[PDB]
Design an enzyme around this catalytic site. Structure first.
Site, PDB file in Angstrom:
ATOM      1  CB  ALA A  78     -29.872   2.704 -40.111  1.00  6.17           C
ATOM      2  CB  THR A  79     -23.733   3.224 -39.572  1.00  6.17           C
ATOM      3  OG1 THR A  79     -23.766   4.177 -40.641  1.00  6.17           O
ATOM      4  CG2 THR A  79     -22.404   2.466 -39.625  1.00  6.17           C
ATOM      5  CB  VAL A  91     -32.391  13.718 -29.353  1.00 12.39           C
ATOM      6  CG1 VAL A  91     -31.880  13.065 -28.133  1.00 12.39           C
ATOM      7  CG2 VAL A  91     -31.863  12.986 -30.553  1.00 12.39           C
ATOM      8  CB  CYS A 132     -18.756  15.318 -36.385  1.00 13.91           C
ATOM      9  SG  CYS A 132     -19.281  14.624 -37.968  1.00 13.91           S
ATOM     10  NE  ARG A 136     -24.873  13.624 -41.447  1.00 17.30           N
ATOM     11  CZ  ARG A 136     -25.732  14.052 -42.357  1.00 17.30           C
ATOM     12  NH1 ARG A 136     -25.764  15.343 -42.651  1.00 17.30           N
ATOM     13  NH2 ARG A 136     -26.599  13.223 -42.927  1.00 17.30           N
TER      14      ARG A 136
HETATM   15  N1  SAH Z   1     -31.762  17.262 -33.072  1.00 17.74           N
HETATM   16  C1  SAH Z   1     -31.342  16.159 -33.683  1.00 17.74           C
HETATM   17  N2  SAH Z   1     -31.900  14.939 -33.364  1.00 17.74           N
HETATM   18  C2  SAH Z   1     -31.471  13.794 -33.998  1.00 17.74           C
HETATM   19  N3  SAH Z   1     -30.484  13.857 -34.951  1.00 17.74           N
HETATM   20  C3  SAH Z   1     -29.945  15.053 -35.275  1.00 17.74           C
HETATM   21  C4  SAH Z   1     -30.345  16.219 -34.649  1.00 17.74           C
HETATM   22  N4  SAH Z   1     -29.617  17.231 -35.173  1.00 17.74           N
HETATM   23  C5  SAH Z   1     -28.763  16.725 -36.099  1.00 17.74           C
HETATM   24  N5  SAH Z   1     -28.960  15.371 -36.159  1.00 17.74           N
HETATM   25  C6  SAH Z   1     -28.294  14.355 -36.989  1.00 17.74           C
HETATM   26  O1  SAH Z   1     -27.200  13.772 -36.307  1.00 17.74           O
HETATM   27  C7  SAH Z   1     -26.303  13.196 -37.227  1.00 17.74           C
HETATM   28  C8  SAH Z   1     -24.869  13.386 -36.730  1.00 17.74           C
HETATM   29  S1  SAH Z   1     -23.560  12.537 -37.660  1.00 17.74           S
HETATM   30  C9  SAH Z   1     -24.429  10.946 -37.689  1.00 17.74           C
HETATM   31  C10 SAH Z   1     -23.493   9.755 -37.874  1.00 17.74           C
HETATM   32  C11 SAH Z   1     -24.195   8.401 -37.840  1.00 17.74           C
HETATM   33  N6  SAH Z   1     -23.551   7.511 -36.885  1.00 17.74           N
HETATM   34  C12 SAH Z   1     -24.208   7.762 -39.224  1.00 17.74           C
HETATM   35  O2  SAH Z   1     -23.724   6.645 -39.407  1.00 17.74           O
HETATM   36  O3  SAH Z   1     -24.691   8.347 -40.194  1.00 17.74           O
HETATM   37  C13 SAH Z   1     -26.597  13.906 -38.537  1.00 17.74           C
HETATM   38  O4  SAH Z   1     -26.969  12.961 -39.514  1.00 17.74           O
HETATM   39  C14 SAH Z   1     -27.736  14.873 -38.297  1.00 17.74           C
HETATM   40  O5  SAH Z   1     -28.682  14.777 -39.333  1.00 17.74           O
END
Ligand code: SAH
Ligand code: SAH
Ligand code: ZN
Ligand code: ZN
Ligand code: ZN
Ligand code: ZN
Ligand code: ZN
Ligand code: ZN
EC number: 2.1.1.37
Lengths: 425, 425
Positions: free
Chosen positions: A169-170, A212, A235, A404
């Site tokens: 939740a950044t 999602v 990533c 991440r």
């Molecule tokens: N199917 C999915 N649905 C939602 N999130 C997923 C997913 N598969 C992986 N992820 C999540 O997507 C993220 C990508 S990196 C997330 C960066 C985020 N902006 C932050 O500040 O933390 C990871 O934390 C991973 O847990």
């Protein structure tokens, strides 16, 4: 290119008329860091390969040609560049690489103190050219993003955010830091630790969704109009830091389209001129055709933003979107810590001024080599002190969770002009 | 499952209470062809694997469990099924497979003349259950397609078609065969041979575009409103017939999204109630998560249509779309040739009644084994006589060109109710 550079040093061919990466005659560009021409295939290779780093924290390939079979790593502190044996045979001379191996304290040519050599000379405005080089990506020409006129202050309302791949939740945190009233914050995420982090730190306000791929257009409609849709694809599989790189297009690429779909689901119709904004984030160490397909689908030109300008981490990331002022230069406020040492705990001293995260253990404490502590990794990325200490999780997982995430002052920089369009606390 | 079927034959467990594919206790469905239960993972495996055929023209895996390590191929003419050694040890008895290998003229259990065995018995309405089995895919629940009310006959106008991955212009040909006036027919394609085929056969009427990835939303807007958008993703890499199966999601999957994008670009806005129609086509031998993602993005339920009902080829294909009457049963007109022999040249006799294309050489002519001739492959798929003999191309390429194409009477069946919405010649 050995015979061609023979003719270059005989003053029969200009070095600027030859592509110093592979010896091609199809010179279109100039090499941004050094003297010579540059062909387009080498530009694509340079896009993919330049910011690729191995597990040792040094570059995966040679800095010049973005290839090379055996490379020379650099001795200078915080420098991570490598120069393969073949490149050094032309630009510094034959056998100079084999002789340069024997020089135990060796400095690379971007770090050399003289700055001037015989065949190779360093071009002076190389950081400016590096910034211009991404503006030079006019191959993927696209229309400019639609600029929406500012809403008067009395009329402003709380922002509504759909946040895909939310992580820790950044985005909501940054919106709070900017003092923007948040009507609601819908978030899809699957990693339980990140869910928990958001839950605790943002006090139940976040309405948690599942995967999602379970979010339908009906879901998007019934959860109210959205004012801001944000997200960043996974990533870890794109990054060269993970040893098990089975693929790049698998898993992460598919999930990209999920963002794409829900973006169209959340977008107002034509004729509905209400303000609407979106942000997609990704790494710079990615494929060219991948980057093209992403640019094609989001119908926009990427902006590369490096967190080094405002934070103590090398975090170069692409940001697609239509937020106003996404191109403008990054300013670092006094609260931000441009030196690694200010982010350390007391009693620790950092030989490094920046931590490269996209001499493994960055810290000399009590004449010993240690990893950054979790709370310091938070301080490097700009997170509030003790942000991820919520549940009972291991250190490896918690570091990974922090790793991440989006860089907080970069995201503050991007989200800041949204204050001109929504309500304040 | 060896011990569980021991308890099944001791009359202590019902065979219908056990999953006869893998021996799971999580019975949700019944096996569509034979007696037993079926778990969901085996349903996903069955979706992926049942209609997968090897280069020998026989099934890639066992018909029962959709796995198996060494299989028994079937001797009966036109039957392509295989039963692995392990399955035959339960349902026919131990050592029955090793004894059945020695039976040189052997018939498989879907083709056995008796139709009744001890532990294994064939369920009677299996073709009906096979048709129902795809209606049974209610896991991917979606809303029914929006039905548009018929436009009066005097008000009808010529149809406008955007056709992605056009190939040899099967769509426009079928629209002509139905006597629908075509205002314009925009087509994206990259294979020069297919471009040429369309050019000649459709007499310059087709406005040729390049690669689908070069088509922008601006292009879609300035080429006039479209009434019908059609397309089928590349199937050669998805099909098991190509020996070099490097991947399935690469190349073909990316190009799928191109259709997706342009579909949204060509779609009228909400509140614009003008009739608009679209069709996407794909193979049945595809991944389950792939099929789910396709269903998620096109926001619809696939219809499987097999060309055997109306033509002399086994051509089972998915059709997503909102054309009226896409579910209704297929009728074969007298012009269509349900037997392979009617499609042969004079002097040739076909041992086969159908050609499996998704005993390699299907024809006995003059007591010799030959491939179908190119003009006969055209006759099998319903194309007009001598349709692809335009330019000077090799036979291998020309067969390949025909092989990818849509089955003409199936496409006629789908496109037929469009006559109720547009103008006639
Ligand atoms: N199917 C999915 N649905 C939602 N999130 C997923 C997913 N598969 C992986 N992820 C999540 O997507 C993220 C990508 S990196 C997330 C960066 C985020 N902006 C932050 O500040 O933390 C990871 O934390 C991973 O847990
Ligand atoms: N990038 C691209 N743009 C347009 N067409 C492409 C393409 N890549 C492959 N194709 C074409 O897409 C077709 C997929 S199969 C085409 C079937 C078509 N309905 C017919 O009746 O023939 C192939 O003919 C292939 O040549
Ligand atoms: Zn080059
Ligand atoms: Zn090199
Ligand atoms: Zn250096
Ligand atoms: Zn099972
Ligand atoms: Zn089997
Ligand atoms: Zn058989």
């Amino acid at each position: 290119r050995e015979r061609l550079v023979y003719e270059v040093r005989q003053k029969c061919r200009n070095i600027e008329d030859i592509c110093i990466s592979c010896g091609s005659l199809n010179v279109t560009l100039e090499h941004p860091l050094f003297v010579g021409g540059m062909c387009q295939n080498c530009k694509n290779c340079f896009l993919e390969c330049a910011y690729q780093y191995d597990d040792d924290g040094y570059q995966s390939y040679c800095t010049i040609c973005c290839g090379g079979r055996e490379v020379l790593m650099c001795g200078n502190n915080n420098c991570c560049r490598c120069f393969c044996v073949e490149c050094v045979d032309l630009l510094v001379g034959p056998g100079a690489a084999q002789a340069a191996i024997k020089e135990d304290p060796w400095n690379c040519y971007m770090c050399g103190h003289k700055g001037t050599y015989g065949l190779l000379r360093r071009r002076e405005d190389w950081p400016s050219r590096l910034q211009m080089f991404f503006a030079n990506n006019h191959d993927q020409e696209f229309d400019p993003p639609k600029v929406y006129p500012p809403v008067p202050a009395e009329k402003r309302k709380p922002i509504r955010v759909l946040s895909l791949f939310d992580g820790i939740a950044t985005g909501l945190l940054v919106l709070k830091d900017l003092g923007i009233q948040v009507d609601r914050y819908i978030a899809s995420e699957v990693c339980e630790d990140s869910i928990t982090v958001g839950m605790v730190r943002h006090q139940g306000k976040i309405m948690y969704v599942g995967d999602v791929r379970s979010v339908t257009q009906k879901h998007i409609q019934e959860w109210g109009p959205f004012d801001l849709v944000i997200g960043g694809s996974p990533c870890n599989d794109l990054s060269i830091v993970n040893p098990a790189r089975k693929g790049l297009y698998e898993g992460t690429g598919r999930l990209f389209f999920e963002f794409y779909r829900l973006l169209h689901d959340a977008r107002p119709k034509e004729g509905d001129d209400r303000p609407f904004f979106w942000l997609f984030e990704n790494v710079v160490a990615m494929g060219v055709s991948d980057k093209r397909d992403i640019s094609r689908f989001l119908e926009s030109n990427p902006v590369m933003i490096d967190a080094k300008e405002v934070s103590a981490a090398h975090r170069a990331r692409y940001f697609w979107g239509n937020l106003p002022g996404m191109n403008r230069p990054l300013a670092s406020t006094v609260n931000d810590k441009l030196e690694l040492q200010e982010c350390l705990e007391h009693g620790r001293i950092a030989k490094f001024s920046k931590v490269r995260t996209i001499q493994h253990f960055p810290v000399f404490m009590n004449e010993k080599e240690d990893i950054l502590w979790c709370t310091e990794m938070e301080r490097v990325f700009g997170f509030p002190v003790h942000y991820t200490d919520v549940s009972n999780m291991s250190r490896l997982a918690r570091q990974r969770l922090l790793g991440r995430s989006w860089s907080v002052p970069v995201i503050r920089h991007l989200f800041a002009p949204l204050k001109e369009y929504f309500a304040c606390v």
